[PDB]
Design a protein around this motif. Structure first.
Motif, short mmCIF file in Angstrom:
data_model
loop_
_atom_site.label_atom_id
_atom_site.label_comp_id
_atom_site.label_asym_id
_atom_site.label_seq_id
_atom_site.Cartn_x
_atom_site.Cartn_y
_atom_site.Cartn_z
N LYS A 27 -3.33 -0.37 30.21
CA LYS A 27 -4.65 -0.59 29.57
C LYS A 27 -5.60 -1.45 30.41
CE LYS A 27 -3.75 0.48 24.75
NZ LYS A 27 -3.71 -0.05 23.38
N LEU B 255 -9.66 2.98 29.57
CA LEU B 255 -10.39 3.14 28.30
C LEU B 255 -11.63 4.04 28.41
CD1 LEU B 255 -9.34 1.78 25.70
CD2 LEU B 255 -11.43 0.42 25.77
N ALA B 256 -12.31 4.02 29.55
CA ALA B 256 -13.41 4.94 29.89
C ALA B 256 -13.03 6.42 29.66
CB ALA B 256 -13.86 4.74 31.34
N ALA C 253 -10.31 7.41 27.73
CA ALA C 253 -10.08 7.47 26.27
C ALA C 253 -11.32 7.71 25.41
CB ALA C 253 -9.30 6.22 25.81
N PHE C 254 -12.38 7.02 25.81
CA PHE C 254 -13.73 7.13 25.26
C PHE C 254 -14.27 8.56 25.33
CE2 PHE C 254 -18.36 6.26 24.99
CZ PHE C 254 -18.33 5.40 23.87
N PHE D 293 -12.38 11.20 23.16
CA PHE D 293 -12.84 11.02 21.77
C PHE D 293 -14.29 11.48 21.51
CE2 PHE D 293 -9.77 7.09 21.82
CZ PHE D 293 -8.68 7.91 21.40
N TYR E 59 -21.12 7.94 22.94
CA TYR E 59 -20.76 7.21 21.70
C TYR E 59 -19.57 7.91 21.03
CZ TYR E 59 -25.98 6.45 21.85
OH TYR E 59 -27.27 6.20 22.20
N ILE E 60 -19.05 7.26 20.00
CA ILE E 60 -18.18 7.87 18.97
C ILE E 60 -18.81 7.63 17.58
CG2 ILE E 60 -15.88 7.40 17.82
CD1 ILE E 60 -16.06 7.63 21.56
N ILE F 88 -9.10 8.56 16.09
CA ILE F 88 -8.71 7.29 16.75
C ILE F 88 -7.79 6.47 15.82
CG2 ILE F 88 -9.49 5.36 18.16
CD1 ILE F 88 -12.35 6.76 18.02
#
Ligand SMILES: [Ca+2]
Ligand SMILES: [Ca+2]
Lengths: 34, 34
Positions: free
Chosen positions: B1, B6-7, B9-10, B13, B20-21, B29
């Motif tokens: 992590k 995370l970029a 993962a973003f 999603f 955005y989400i 999520i």
């Protein structure tokens, strides 16, 4: 149950223009559930 | 992590590519990893 929960885990984390979540807020969701 | 990890993962999603989400996307999520 399910319906309510969603709205909350949006709104708790979701500070800005929320209709949306961003990267930091996304991190927060991950931290909450794993 | 990491921010870098995370970029991705973003992006995974962020189906509608808005940087955005949103609420429905949030469901996916939240489910992970129960
Ligand atoms: Ca927000
Ligand atoms: Ca999106």
């Amino acid at each position: 149950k399910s319906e309510e929960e969603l709205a909350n885990a949006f709104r708790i984390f979701d500070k800005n223009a929320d209709g949306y979540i961003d990267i930091e807020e996304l991190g927060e969701i991950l931290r909450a559930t794993g």
